[PDB]
Amino acid sequence: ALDWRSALTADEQRSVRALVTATTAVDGVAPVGEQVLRELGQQRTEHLLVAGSRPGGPIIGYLNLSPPGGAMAELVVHPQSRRRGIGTAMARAALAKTAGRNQFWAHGTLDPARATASALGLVGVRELIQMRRPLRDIPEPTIPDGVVIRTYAGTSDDAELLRVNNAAFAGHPEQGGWTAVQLAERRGEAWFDPDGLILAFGDGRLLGFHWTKVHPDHPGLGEVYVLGVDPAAQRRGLGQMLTSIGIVSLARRLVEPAVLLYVESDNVAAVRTYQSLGFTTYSVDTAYAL
Ligand SMILES: CC(=O)SCCNC(=O)CCNC(=O)[C@H](O)C(C)(C)COP(=O)(O)OP(=O)(O)OC[C@H]1O[C@@H](n2cnc3c(N)ncnc32)[C@H](O)[C@@H]1OP(=O)(O)O
Ligand SMILES: CC(=O)SCCNC(=O)CCNC(=O)[C@H](O)C(C)(C)COP(=O)(O)OP(=O)(O)OC[C@H]1O[C@@H](n2cnc3c(N)ncnc32)[C@H](O)[C@@H]1OP(=O)(O)O
């Protein structure tokens, strides 16, 4: 009988991290994301832990349900305990609990998840594509005159940065409607580098920005973290230009070494921008729902 938990002891947390680590080693992709792992020590989400057969042992299944749209579930069954109905049981428990509204993330959209989705009568409703390109044979930026490029100068630039971010991402669930609070939270992370946030200004109002990211724990990789062009300055080549400039900067600072990004599969403009600069699909995360 699956018991929804709102909190976990230190041992239980260690048992879930062990299950996740064991699974990544076999599957080659982590089964739940980094934020799920940060939620293990908090009381903000709900969890299912499926214990093994004998006392004193490791767990064999885990599901996290994060509140919102519908809630989002991430789950994992140990490679050695698959094809025994555990994933199906935890998934049906989440659907019953959320009235059939929650979604499920499948990192890497691996064969088992696709089949399990099929078996549960779910369909893919979102695809988040991770694209990558090598740090070699990189593009050259074309800077149109009437535009000047420089890096972020601190809080002096925040008003414009939020204005542009919020105009470009207007109506976007998570990236739109930002405030100084979101900026401060990110500037507070160890990976932040003000010189990695590139800005293009008219020659002037901010026209667009490309926030790049190098994480200390993933050597040799750079990320196009947020790219946004004010709609008043879109369709003039700035988005590509900014992405190019960021690749140059990351390649200077830095499987194979590379620049990666995550983009919604139906974001036509961004996908085209990235395709023009040589990015290709590396992996896809599919959100499954009824
Ligand atoms: C919709 C989702 O599951 S999103 C889940 C995202 N999580 C992951 O991808 C993490 C890595 N994968 C896992 O942890 C597991 O493989 C899970 C959670 C996807 C499935 O866990 P399991 O406990 O093996 O699922 P379960 O035993 O209930 O399988 C249900 C049915 O789906 C199918 N299925 C599951 N895995 C496979 C597979 N590798 N190949 C073919 N069919 C499969 C079968 O029809 C199966 O029943 P059957 O064994 O009687 O034929
Ligand atoms: C990793 C991430 O940041 S994913 C999130 C990306 N950012 C967003 O979704 C924010 C909202 N969108 C935007 O800010 C912009 O549309 C951007 C940044 C994606 C592109 O900015 P732009 O300045 O318009 O880019 P640019 O003028 O160089 O055009 C690049 C390509 O997109 C295409 N494009 C631009 N706007 C559109 C549009 N409205 N419809 C269809 N295609 C478009 C261009 O035709 C061009 O295609 P091509 O590469 O095949 O030549």
mmCIF file of C-alpha atoms and ligand atoms in Angstrom:
data_model
loop_
_atom_site.group_PDB
_atom_site.id
_atom_site.type_symbol
_atom_site.label_atom_id
_atom_site.label_comp_id
_atom_site.label_asym_id
_atom_site.label_seq_id
_atom_site.Cartn_x
_atom_site.Cartn_y
_atom_site.Cartn_z
ATOM 1 C CA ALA A 1 0.000 0.000 0.000
ATOM 2 C CA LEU A 2 1.544 3.285 -1.241
ATOM 3 C CA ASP A 3 1.775 5.952 1.428
ATOM 4 C CA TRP A 4 2.014 9.553 0.355
ATOM 5 C CA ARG A 5 4.754 11.294 2.334
ATOM 6 C CA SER A 6 5.162 15.058 2.781
ATOM 7 C CA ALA A 7 8.607 14.712 4.349
ATOM 8 C CA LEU A 8 11.559 12.238 4.566
ATOM 9 C CA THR A 9 14.167 11.349 7.170
ATOM 10 C CA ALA A 10 17.872 11.749 6.436
ATOM 11 C CA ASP A 11 18.247 7.971 5.879
ATOM 12 C CA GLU A 12 15.279 7.896 3.513
ATOM 13 C CA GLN A 13 16.779 10.805 1.603
ATOM 14 C CA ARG A 14 20.066 8.942 1.334
ATOM 15 C CA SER A 15 18.088 5.859 0.169
ATOM 16 C CA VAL A 16 16.387 7.824 -2.618
ATOM 17 C CA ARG A 17 19.680 9.412 -3.789
ATOM 18 C CA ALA A 18 21.186 5.902 -3.852
ATOM 19 C CA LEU A 19 18.355 4.648 -6.047
ATOM 20 C CA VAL A 20 18.732 7.616 -8.405
ATOM 21 C CA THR A 21 22.515 7.267 -8.662
ATOM 22 C CA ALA A 22 22.223 3.500 -9.273
ATOM 23 C CA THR A 23 19.722 4.135 -12.033
ATOM 24 C CA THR A 24 21.775 6.827 -13.790
ATOM 25 C CA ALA A 25 24.690 4.425 -13.933
ATOM 26 C CA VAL A 26 22.648 1.823 -15.839
ATOM 27 C CA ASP A 27 20.343 4.031 -17.898
ATOM 28 C CA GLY A 28 22.971 6.651 -18.750
ATOM 29 C CA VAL A 29 20.414 9.426 -17.933
ATOM 30 C CA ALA A 30 19.348 10.576 -14.438
ATOM 31 C CA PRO A 31 15.709 9.436 -13.888
ATOM 32 C CA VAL A 32 14.573 12.480 -11.926
ATOM 33 C CA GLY A 33 15.916 16.027 -12.155
ATOM 34 C CA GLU A 34 18.088 18.122 -10.000
ATOM 35 C CA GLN A 35 15.288 20.082 -8.468
ATOM 36 C CA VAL A 36 13.554 16.820 -7.374
ATOM 37 C CA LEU A 37 16.755 15.970 -5.613
ATOM 38 C CA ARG A 38 16.728 19.390 -3.848
ATOM 39 C CA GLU A 39 13.143 18.707 -2.753
ATOM 40 C CA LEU A 40 14.148 15.543 -0.795
ATOM 41 C CA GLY A 41 15.197 17.601 2.180
ATOM 42 C CA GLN A 42 12.199 19.907 2.122
ATOM 43 C CA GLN A 43 8.508 19.592 3.047
ATOM 44 C CA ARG A 44 7.130 21.234 -0.158
ATOM 45 C CA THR A 45 6.294 18.141 -2.228
ATOM 46 C CA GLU A 46 4.836 14.695 -1.900
ATOM 47 C CA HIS A 47 6.594 11.378 -2.282
ATOM 48 C CA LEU A 48 6.161 7.617 -2.669
ATOM 49 C CA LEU A 49 8.959 5.243 -1.459
ATOM 50 C CA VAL A 50 8.633 1.539 -2.337
ATOM 51 C CA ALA A 51 10.723 -0.557 0.023
ATOM 52 C CA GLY A 52 12.500 -3.737 -0.791
ATOM 53 C CA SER A 53 11.522 -7.210 0.545
ATOM 54 C CA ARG A 54 13.751 -7.627 3.558
ATOM 55 C CA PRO A 55 14.319 -5.196 6.426
ATOM 56 C CA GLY A 56 17.407 -2.992 6.471
ATOM 57 C CA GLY A 57 17.478 -2.804 2.652
ATOM 58 C CA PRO A 58 17.519 -0.161 -0.101
ATOM 59 C CA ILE A 59 14.374 1.159 -1.762
ATOM 60 C CA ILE A 60 13.228 -0.087 -5.185
ATOM 61 C CA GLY A 61 10.884 2.673 -6.313
ATOM 62 C CA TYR A 62 10.417 6.374 -5.877
ATOM 63 C CA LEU A 63 8.007 9.013 -7.149
ATOM 64 C CA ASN A 64 7.964 12.778 -6.424
ATOM 65 C CA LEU A 65 4.826 14.898 -7.028
ATOM 66 C CA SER A 66 5.526 18.636 -7.185
ATOM 67 C CA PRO A 67 2.641 21.053 -7.025
ATOM 68 C CA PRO A 68 1.839 23.298 -10.032
ATOM 69 C CA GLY A 69 -1.835 23.474 -14.680
ATOM 70 C CA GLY A 70 -1.373 20.025 -13.241
ATOM 71 C CA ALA A 71 1.248 18.811 -10.778
ATOM 72 C CA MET A 72 4.377 17.178 -12.193
ATOM 73 C CA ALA A 73 5.489 13.705 -11.230
ATOM 74 C CA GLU A 74 9.000 12.221 -11.676
ATOM 75 C CA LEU A 75 9.537 8.522 -10.868
ATOM 76 C CA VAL A 76 12.072 5.774 -10.993
ATOM 77 C CA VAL A 77 12.105 2.018 -10.448
ATOM 78 C CA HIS A 78 15.501 0.372 -9.846
ATOM 79 C CA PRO A 79 16.812 -1.360 -13.008
ATOM 80 C CA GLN A 80 16.815 -4.709 -11.158
ATOM 81 C CA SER A 81 13.178 -4.366 -10.100
ATOM 82 C CA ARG A 82 11.574 -3.330 -13.402
ATOM 83 C CA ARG A 83 8.767 -5.151 -15.298
ATOM 84 C CA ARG A 84 7.058 -6.061 -12.063
ATOM 85 C CA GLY A 85 4.359 -3.393 -12.048
ATOM 86 C CA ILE A 86 5.934 -0.953 -9.579
ATOM 87 C CA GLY A 87 6.146 1.986 -11.988
ATOM 88 C CA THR A 88 2.556 1.335 -13.107
ATOM 89 C CA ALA A 89 1.392 1.291 -9.471
ATOM 90 C CA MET A 90 3.092 4.535 -8.501
ATOM 91 C CA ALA A 91 1.914 6.212 -11.736
ATOM 92 C CA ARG A 92 -1.717 5.114 -11.261
ATOM 93 C CA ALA A 93 -1.470 6.396 -7.668
ATOM 94 C CA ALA A 94 -0.382 9.826 -8.882
ATOM 95 C CA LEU A 95 -3.214 9.903 -11.520
ATOM 96 C CA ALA A 96 -5.828 8.900 -8.976
ATOM 97 C CA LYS A 97 -4.528 11.546 -6.569
ATOM 98 C CA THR A 98 -4.514 14.336 -9.130
ATOM 99 C CA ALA A 99 -7.747 13.443 -10.814
ATOM 100 C CA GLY A 100 -5.904 12.427 -13.986
ATOM 101 C CA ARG A 101 -4.375 15.916 -14.275
ATOM 102 C CA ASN A 102 -0.712 15.483 -13.326
ATOM 103 C CA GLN A 103 1.961 15.036 -15.964
ATOM 104 C CA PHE A 104 5.031 12.747 -15.825
ATOM 105 C CA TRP A 105 8.521 13.673 -17.005
ATOM 106 C CA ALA A 106 10.520 11.092 -18.958
ATOM 107 C CA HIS A 107 14.125 12.305 -19.070
ATOM 108 C CA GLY A 108 15.683 11.238 -22.336
ATOM 109 C CA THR A 109 12.355 9.636 -23.395
ATOM 110 C CA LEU A 110 13.911 6.175 -22.996
ATOM 111 C CA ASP A 111 12.312 2.979 -24.318
ATOM 112 C CA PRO A 112 10.972 1.809 -20.929
ATOM 113 C CA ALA A 113 9.196 5.171 -20.226
ATOM 114 C CA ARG A 114 7.747 5.300 -23.744
ATOM 115 C CA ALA A 115 6.360 1.743 -23.397
ATOM 116 C CA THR A 116 5.092 2.429 -19.864
ATOM 117 C CA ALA A 117 3.385 5.552 -21.102
ATOM 118 C CA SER A 118 1.812 3.477 -23.867
ATOM 119 C CA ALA A 119 0.692 0.868 -21.372
ATOM 120 C CA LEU A 120 -0.878 3.470 -19.174
ATOM 121 C CA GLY A 121 -2.765 5.090 -22.065
ATOM 122 C CA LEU A 122 -0.848 8.378 -21.780
ATOM 123 C CA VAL A 123 0.412 10.506 -24.642
ATOM 124 C CA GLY A 124 3.235 12.981 -24.958
ATOM 125 C CA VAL A 125 2.012 16.563 -24.525
ATOM 126 C CA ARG A 126 5.336 18.408 -24.351
ATOM 127 C CA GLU A 127 8.791 17.727 -25.694
ATOM 128 C CA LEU A 128 11.721 19.790 -24.268
ATOM 129 C CA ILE A 129 14.654 19.314 -26.639
ATOM 130 C CA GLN A 130 18.269 19.426 -25.414
ATOM 131 C CA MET A 131 20.375 20.531 -28.414
ATOM 132 C CA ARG A 132 24.196 20.643 -28.449
ATOM 133 C CA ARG A 133 27.010 21.693 -30.761
ATOM 134 C CA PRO A 134 30.796 21.284 -30.494
ATOM 135 C CA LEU A 135 33.076 24.067 -29.334
ATOM 136 C CA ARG A 136 34.934 23.701 -32.652
ATOM 137 C CA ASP A 137 34.226 25.123 -36.083
ATOM 138 C CA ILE A 138 32.033 27.650 -34.412
ATOM 139 C CA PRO A 139 30.069 30.485 -36.081
ATOM 140 C CA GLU A 140 31.207 34.158 -36.511
ATOM 141 C CA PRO A 141 28.818 36.856 -35.362
ATOM 142 C CA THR A 142 27.436 39.511 -37.736
ATOM 143 C CA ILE A 143 27.038 42.775 -35.844
ATOM 144 C CA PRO A 144 24.627 45.171 -37.696
ATOM 145 C CA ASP A 145 25.477 48.734 -37.160
ATOM 146 C CA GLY A 146 23.181 50.634 -34.902
ATOM 147 C CA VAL A 147 23.954 47.933 -32.291
ATOM 148 C CA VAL A 148 26.616 47.732 -29.608
ATOM 149 C CA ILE A 149 27.432 44.720 -27.514
ATOM 150 C CA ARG A 150 28.636 44.675 -23.901
ATOM 151 C CA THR A 151 28.350 42.561 -20.755
ATOM 152 C CA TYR A 152 25.975 43.028 -17.825
ATOM 153 C CA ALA A 153 27.092 45.995 -15.585
ATOM 154 C CA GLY A 154 25.162 44.999 -12.478
ATOM 155 C CA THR A 155 21.948 46.345 -10.920
ATOM 156 C CA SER A 156 22.124 49.418 -13.251
ATOM 157 C CA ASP A 157 20.990 47.056 -16.052
ATOM 158 C CA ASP A 158 18.234 45.210 -14.166
ATOM 159 C CA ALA A 159 15.320 47.424 -15.167
ATOM 160 C CA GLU A 160 16.007 46.934 -18.881
ATOM 161 C CA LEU A 161 16.882 43.266 -18.430
ATOM 162 C CA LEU A 162 13.589 42.535 -16.723
ATOM 163 C CA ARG A 163 11.676 44.668 -19.255
ATOM 164 C CA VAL A 164 13.188 42.762 -22.210
ATOM 165 C CA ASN A 165 12.939 39.361 -20.562
ATOM 166 C CA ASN A 166 9.314 39.957 -19.704
ATOM 167 C CA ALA A 167 8.409 41.437 -23.199
ATOM 168 C CA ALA A 168 10.060 38.465 -25.023
ATOM 169 C CA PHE A 169 8.658 35.824 -22.713
ATOM 170 C CA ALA A 170 5.264 37.423 -22.297
ATOM 171 C CA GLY A 171 2.823 34.667 -21.371
ATOM 172 C CA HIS A 172 5.590 32.099 -20.628
ATOM 173 C CA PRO A 173 4.759 30.069 -17.498
ATOM 174 C CA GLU A 174 8.147 30.217 -15.871
ATOM 175 C CA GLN A 175 10.352 32.713 -17.718
ATOM 176 C CA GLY A 176 7.876 35.527 -18.004
ATOM 177 C CA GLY A 177 6.883 38.042 -15.327
ATOM 178 C CA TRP A 178 10.248 38.116 -13.601
ATOM 179 C CA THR A 179 11.300 40.566 -10.889
ATOM 180 C CA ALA A 180 14.551 41.452 -9.086
ATOM 181 C CA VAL A 181 13.829 38.425 -6.939
ATOM 182 C CA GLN A 182 14.490 35.991 -9.737
ATOM 183 C CA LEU A 183 17.621 37.819 -10.782
ATOM 184 C CA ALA A 184 18.933 37.931 -7.239
ATOM 185 C CA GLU A 185 18.364 34.239 -6.806
ATOM 186 C CA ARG A 186 20.415 33.426 -9.884
ATOM 187 C CA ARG A 187 23.204 35.927 -9.143
ATOM 188 C CA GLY A 188 23.454 34.168 -5.805
ATOM 189 C CA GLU A 189 24.320 30.820 -7.432
ATOM 190 C CA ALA A 190 28.023 29.891 -7.728
ATOM 191 C CA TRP A 191 27.793 29.547 -11.474
ATOM 192 C CA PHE A 192 26.745 33.163 -12.045
ATOM 193 C CA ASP A 193 29.252 35.217 -13.961
ATOM 194 C CA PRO A 194 28.243 38.784 -14.870
ATOM 195 C CA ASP A 195 30.564 38.662 -17.853
ATOM 196 C CA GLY A 196 28.626 35.659 -19.125
ATOM 197 C CA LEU A 197 25.448 37.766 -19.503
ATOM 198 C CA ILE A 198 25.766 39.450 -22.887
ATOM 199 C CA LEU A 199 23.627 42.512 -23.828
ATOM 200 C CA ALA A 200 22.967 44.223 -27.138
ATOM 201 C CA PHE A 201 21.901 47.887 -27.128
ATOM 202 C CA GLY A 202 20.859 50.255 -29.834
ATOM 203 C CA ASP A 203 23.385 52.916 -30.734
ATOM 204 C CA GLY A 204 20.123 53.201 -26.142
ATOM 205 C CA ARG A 205 17.420 50.737 -25.086
ATOM 206 C CA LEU A 206 18.335 47.091 -24.466
ATOM 207 C CA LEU A 207 17.414 45.113 -27.623
ATOM 208 C CA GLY A 208 18.177 41.606 -26.367
ATOM 209 C CA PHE A 209 20.342 39.463 -24.122
ATOM 210 C CA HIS A 210 22.040 36.085 -23.980
ATOM 211 C CA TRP A 211 22.664 34.677 -20.519
ATOM 212 C CA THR A 212 25.351 31.963 -20.771
ATOM 213 C CA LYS A 213 26.171 29.486 -18.006
ATOM 214 C CA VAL A 214 29.131 27.326 -17.087
ATOM 215 C CA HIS A 215 28.350 25.084 -14.083
ATOM 216 C CA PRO A 216 31.361 24.245 -11.845
ATOM 217 C CA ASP A 217 30.245 20.662 -11.594
ATOM 218 C CA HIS A 218 30.002 19.948 -15.351
ATOM 219 C CA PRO A 219 33.461 20.700 -16.859
ATOM 220 C CA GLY A 220 33.818 21.333 -20.550
ATOM 221 C CA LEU A 221 30.155 22.238 -21.009
ATOM 222 C CA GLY A 222 28.571 25.621 -21.553
ATOM 223 C CA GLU A 223 24.882 26.426 -21.734
ATOM 224 C CA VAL A 224 22.735 28.949 -23.687
ATOM 225 C CA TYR A 225 20.760 29.503 -20.428
ATOM 226 C CA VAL A 226 18.319 32.292 -21.509
ATOM 227 C CA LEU A 227 18.182 34.045 -24.882
ATOM 228 C CA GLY A 228 15.572 36.832 -25.348
ATOM 229 C CA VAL A 229 15.082 39.647 -27.878
ATOM 230 C CA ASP A 230 12.564 42.446 -27.269
ATOM 231 C CA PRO A 231 9.692 41.872 -29.769
ATOM 232 C CA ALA A 232 10.358 45.502 -30.970
ATOM 233 C CA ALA A 233 13.764 44.333 -32.122
ATOM 234 C CA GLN A 234 12.955 40.739 -33.276
ATOM 235 C CA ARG A 235 13.271 39.454 -36.854
ATOM 236 C CA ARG A 236 16.323 41.650 -37.584
ATOM 237 C CA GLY A 237 19.044 39.038 -36.945
ATOM 238 C CA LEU A 238 19.779 39.902 -33.298
ATOM 239 C CA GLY A 239 18.832 36.576 -31.779
ATOM 240 C CA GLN A 240 21.262 34.653 -33.971
ATOM 241 C CA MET A 241 23.946 37.335 -33.403
ATOM 242 C CA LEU A 242 23.536 37.119 -29.685
ATOM 243 C CA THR A 243 23.678 33.334 -29.657
ATOM 244 C CA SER A 244 26.854 33.464 -31.755
ATOM 245 C CA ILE A 245 28.564 35.970 -29.496
ATOM 246 C CA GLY A 246 27.747 33.758 -26.496
ATOM 247 C CA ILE A 247 29.219 30.674 -28.206
ATOM 248 C CA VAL A 248 32.446 32.626 -28.868
ATOM 249 C CA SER A 249 32.593 33.673 -25.199
ATOM 250 C CA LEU A 250 31.877 30.151 -23.854
ATOM 251 C CA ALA A 251 34.362 28.541 -26.253
ATOM 252 C CA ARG A 252 37.056 30.947 -24.952
ATOM 253 C CA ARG A 253 36.254 30.187 -21.370
ATOM 254 C CA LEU A 254 36.074 26.486 -21.872
ATOM 255 C CA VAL A 255 31.139 13.039 -23.632
ATOM 256 C CA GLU A 256 32.629 15.736 -25.958
ATOM 257 C CA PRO A 257 33.123 19.464 -24.883
ATOM 258 C CA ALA A 258 30.215 21.423 -26.127
ATOM 259 C CA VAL A 259 27.541 24.079 -25.723
ATOM 260 C CA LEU A 260 24.040 22.775 -24.812
ATOM 261 C CA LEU A 261 20.590 24.285 -24.434
ATOM 262 C CA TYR A 262 17.013 23.304 -23.727
ATOM 263 C CA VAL A 263 14.239 24.541 -25.993
ATOM 264 C CA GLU A 264 10.479 23.685 -26.248
ATOM 265 C CA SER A 265 9.999 21.621 -29.416
ATOM 266 C CA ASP A 266 7.403 24.112 -30.831
ATOM 267 C CA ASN A 267 9.413 27.228 -30.253
ATOM 268 C CA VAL A 268 9.885 27.791 -33.949
ATOM 269 C CA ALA A 269 11.966 30.913 -33.824
ATOM 270 C CA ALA A 270 14.430 29.555 -31.220
ATOM 271 C CA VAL A 271 14.722 26.190 -32.870
ATOM 272 C CA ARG A 272 15.488 27.883 -36.183
ATOM 273 C CA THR A 273 18.046 30.192 -34.571
ATOM 274 C CA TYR A 274 19.876 27.266 -33.015
ATOM 275 C CA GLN A 275 19.655 25.096 -36.117
ATOM 276 C CA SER A 276 21.300 27.920 -38.124
ATOM 277 C CA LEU A 277 24.231 27.824 -35.766
ATOM 278 C CA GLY A 278 24.796 24.089 -36.024
ATOM 279 C CA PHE A 279 23.030 22.797 -32.992
ATOM 280 C CA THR A 280 21.465 19.352 -33.347
ATOM 281 C CA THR A 281 19.201 17.298 -31.148
ATOM 282 C CA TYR A 282 21.126 15.604 -28.352
ATOM 283 C CA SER A 283 18.200 14.244 -26.327
ATOM 284 C CA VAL A 284 14.499 14.872 -25.721
ATOM 285 C CA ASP A 285 12.489 15.029 -22.444
ATOM 286 C CA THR A 286 8.815 14.177 -22.926
ATOM 287 C CA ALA A 287 6.051 15.147 -20.477
ATOM 288 C CA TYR A 288 3.314 12.463 -20.640
ATOM 289 C CA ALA A 289 -0.310 13.025 -19.615
ATOM 290 C CA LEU A 290 -3.755 11.606 -20.256
HETATM 291 C C1 LIG B 1 4.993 7.369 -18.089
HETATM 292 C C2 LIG B 1 6.275 7.071 -17.313
HETATM 293 O O1 LIG B 1 6.614 6.045 -16.817
HETATM 294 S S1 LIG B 1 7.370 8.519 -17.144
HETATM 295 C C3 LIG B 1 8.652 7.668 -16.203
HETATM 296 C C4 LIG B 1 9.939 8.338 -16.385
HETATM 297 N N1 LIG B 1 11.002 7.629 -15.607
HETATM 298 C C5 LIG B 1 11.974 6.990 -16.213
HETATM 299 O O2 LIG B 1 12.085 6.857 -17.478
HETATM 300 C C6 LIG B 1 13.055 6.560 -15.249
HETATM 301 C C7 LIG B 1 13.787 5.286 -15.774
HETATM 302 N N2 LIG B 1 12.820 4.199 -15.959
HETATM 303 C C8 LIG B 1 12.250 3.568 -14.898
HETATM 304 O O3 LIG B 1 12.484 3.840 -13.745
HETATM 305 C C9 LIG B 1 11.242 2.491 -15.247
HETATM 306 O O4 LIG B 1 11.689 1.766 -16.449
HETATM 307 C C10 LIG B 1 9.757 3.039 -15.412
HETATM 308 C C11 LIG B 1 9.355 3.875 -14.186
HETATM 309 C C12 LIG B 1 9.598 3.928 -16.740
HETATM 310 C C13 LIG B 1 8.743 1.853 -15.512
HETATM 311 O O5 LIG B 1 8.925 1.075 -14.339
HETATM 312 P P1 LIG B 1 8.491 -0.461 -14.253
HETATM 313 O O6 LIG B 1 8.231 -0.732 -12.863
HETATM 314 O O7 LIG B 1 9.519 -1.345 -15.058
HETATM 315 O O8 LIG B 1 7.097 -0.381 -14.958
HETATM 316 P P2 LIG B 1 6.007 -1.577 -15.103
HETATM 317 O O9 LIG B 1 6.547 -2.888 -14.534
HETATM 318 O O10 LIG B 1 4.821 -1.139 -14.400
HETATM 319 O O11 LIG B 1 5.729 -1.778 -16.661
HETATM 320 C C14 LIG B 1 4.430 -1.465 -17.131
HETATM 321 C C15 LIG B 1 4.318 -1.917 -18.596
HETATM 322 O O12 LIG B 1 5.023 -1.088 -19.509
HETATM 323 C C16 LIG B 1 5.831 -1.861 -20.380
HETATM 324 N N3 LIG B 1 7.258 -1.712 -20.213
HETATM 325 C C17 LIG B 1 7.943 -1.186 -19.128
HETATM 326 N N4 LIG B 1 9.262 -1.216 -19.405
HETATM 327 C C18 LIG B 1 9.390 -1.767 -20.672
HETATM 328 C C19 LIG B 1 10.501 -2.073 -21.551
HETATM 329 N N5 LIG B 1 11.787 -1.837 -21.196
HETATM 330 N N6 LIG B 1 10.249 -2.647 -22.827
HETATM 331 C C20 LIG B 1 8.959 -2.901 -23.215
HETATM 332 N N7 LIG B 1 7.866 -2.652 -22.466
HETATM 333 C C21 LIG B 1 8.088 -2.082 -21.196
HETATM 334 C C22 LIG B 1 5.166 -3.221 -20.309
HETATM 335 O O13 LIG B 1 3.938 -3.236 -21.178
HETATM 336 C C23 LIG B 1 4.890 -3.308 -18.873
HETATM 337 O O14 LIG B 1 4.182 -4.451 -18.424
HETATM 338 P P3 LIG B 1 4.693 -5.941 -18.704
HETATM 339 O O15 LIG B 1 6.121 -6.041 -18.051
HETATM 340 O O16 LIG B 1 3.674 -6.835 -17.998
HETATM 341 O O17 LIG B 1 4.740 -6.152 -20.175
HETATM 342 C C1 LIG B 2 17.759 28.279 -24.458
HETATM 343 C C2 LIG B 2 16.655 29.351 -24.551
HETATM 344 O O1 LIG B 2 16.721 30.480 -24.214
HETATM 345 S S1 LIG B 2 15.071 28.741 -25.290
HETATM 346 C C3 LIG B 2 14.102 30.293 -25.259
HETATM 347 C C4 LIG B 2 14.342 31.224 -26.436
HETATM 348 N N1 LIG B 2 13.751 32.547 -26.153
HETATM 349 C C5 LIG B 2 12.423 32.723 -26.225
HETATM 350 O O2 LIG B 2 11.599 31.804 -26.511
HETATM 351 C C6 LIG B 2 11.991 34.137 -25.925
HETATM 352 C C7 LIG B 2 11.000 34.592 -27.062
HETATM 353 N N2 LIG B 2 11.622 34.649 -28.388
HETATM 354 C C8 LIG B 2 12.533 35.513 -28.682
HETATM 355 O O3 LIG B 2 12.971 36.326 -27.882
HETATM 356 C C9 LIG B 2 13.037 35.477 -30.118
HETATM 357 O O4 LIG B 2 11.974 34.937 -30.965
HETATM 358 C C10 LIG B 2 14.367 34.644 -30.360
HETATM 359 C C11 LIG B 2 15.445 35.144 -29.352
HETATM 360 C C12 LIG B 2 14.100 33.062 -30.153
HETATM 361 C C13 LIG B 2 14.910 34.926 -31.791
HETATM 362 O O5 LIG B 2 15.222 36.320 -31.860
HETATM 363 P P1 LIG B 2 15.306 37.128 -33.205
HETATM 364 O O6 LIG B 2 16.031 38.404 -32.944
HETATM 365 O O7 LIG B 2 13.929 37.212 -33.844
HETATM 366 O O8 LIG B 2 16.229 36.155 -34.052
HETATM 367 P P2 LIG B 2 16.716 36.302 -35.572
HETATM 368 O O9 LIG B 2 16.138 37.563 -36.175
HETATM 369 O O10 LIG B 2 18.177 36.100 -35.687
HETATM 370 O O11 LIG B 2 15.964 35.041 -36.276
HETATM 371 C C14 LIG B 2 16.526 33.737 -36.084
HETATM 372 C C15 LIG B 2 15.655 32.718 -36.809
HETATM 373 O O12 LIG B 2 14.352 32.700 -36.227
HETATM 374 C C16 LIG B 2 13.334 32.952 -37.168
HETATM 375 N N3 LIG B 2 12.153 33.650 -36.581
HETATM 376 C C17 LIG B 2 12.256 34.820 -35.825
HETATM 377 N N4 LIG B 2 11.025 35.224 -35.453
HETATM 378 C C18 LIG B 2 10.159 34.283 -35.974
HETATM 379 C C19 LIG B 2 8.728 34.158 -35.931
HETATM 380 N N5 LIG B 2 7.923 35.077 -35.281
HETATM 381 N N6 LIG B 2 8.134 33.058 -36.558
HETATM 382 C C20 LIG B 2 8.916 32.138 -37.224
HETATM 383 N N7 LIG B 2 10.240 32.176 -37.339
HETATM 384 C C21 LIG B 2 10.889 33.263 -36.694
HETATM 385 C C22 LIG B 2 14.109 33.727 -38.257
HETATM 386 O O13 LIG B 2 13.362 33.679 -39.552
HETATM 387 C C23 LIG B 2 15.406 32.995 -38.299
HETATM 388 O O14 LIG B 2 15.317 31.808 -39.063
HETATM 389 P P3 LIG B 2 16.540 31.254 -39.729
HETATM 390 O O15 LIG B 2 17.562 30.948 -38.556
HETATM 391 O O16 LIG B 2 16.014 29.990 -40.376
HETATM 392 O O17 LIG B 2 17.126 32.251 -40.603
#
